[PDB]
């Protein structure tokens, strides 16, 4: 997150961190057993963190689950990135509680204009290269399509939106790929893609979670 500020220990309980060895993407706790992130962070080998603020130190309140199975939407394109969403279960449940919580699903898509929060652990810089290790938070606006579309000719889907500044400054970053863009106490929105960070007129792109509820309920409830 670039130009965003220090979230505050378990303030985003949702938040997930899935590790490989490292932190390499965020994720949304959308109940005990799945969590939903980006399809362009699958890979094997993930461990699913929960409870985390900083993800370098042990600090009491993590739970640390591996993944038993991913499974990516059937029309991910990872050139276009369109459907850029993967859902990921947990091998064991995670224990609920006010630190360790699931984010509700949205019953409707939210509207330009609409104020969200968005996280994770990605680069805080727009230029250079530097990595918190807290969770960093961004309030930011949904944008219109139009003018998302502007910013990106031929290359923002139906299953796409733009959040943030086309003044630049505010923005999400490199690794906060696949983490929540929230409004409203809803998941609308998965860390996506983006021209860099925080550059004028190149706000991030997020993955339209409206459109996938269907798909999330109907995979959840036979896997
Ligand atoms: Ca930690």
Redesign the pocket.
Request: charged letters at 50%; zero cysteines; aromatic letters at 0%.
């Given at each position: 997150i670039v130009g965003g500020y220090t979230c505050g220990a378990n303030t985003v309980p949702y938040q997930v961190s899935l590790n490989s060895g490292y932190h390499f993407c965020g994720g949304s706790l959308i109940n005990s057993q799945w969590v939903v992130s980006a399809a362009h962070c699958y890979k094997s080998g993930i461990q699913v963190?929960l409870g985390?603020?900083?993800?370098?130190?042990?600090?009491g309140n993590?739970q640390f689950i591996s993944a038993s199975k991913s499974i990516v939407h059937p029309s991910y394109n990872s050139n276009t990135l369109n459907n850029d969403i993967m859902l990921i279960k947990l091998k064991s449940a995670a224990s609920l509680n006010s630190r360790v919580a699931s984010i509700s699903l949205p019953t409707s898509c939210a509207s330009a204009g609409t104020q969200c929060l968005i996280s994770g652990w990605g680069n805080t810089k727009s230029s250079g290269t530097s990595y918190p290790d807290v969770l960093k938070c961004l309030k930011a606006p949904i944008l219109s399509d139009s003018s998302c579309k502007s910013a990106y000719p031929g290359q923002i889907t139906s299953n796409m939106f733009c959040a943030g500044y086309l003044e630049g400054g505010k923005d999400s970053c490199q690794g906060d790929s696949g983490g929540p863009v929230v409004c409203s106490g809803k998941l609308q929105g998965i860390v996506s893609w983006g021209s860099g960070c925080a550059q004028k007129n190149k706000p991030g792109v997020y993955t339209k979670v409206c459109n996938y509820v269907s798909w999330i309920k109907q995979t959840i409830a036979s896997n």
């Open positions: 963190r985390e603020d900083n993800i370098n130190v042990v600090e993590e």
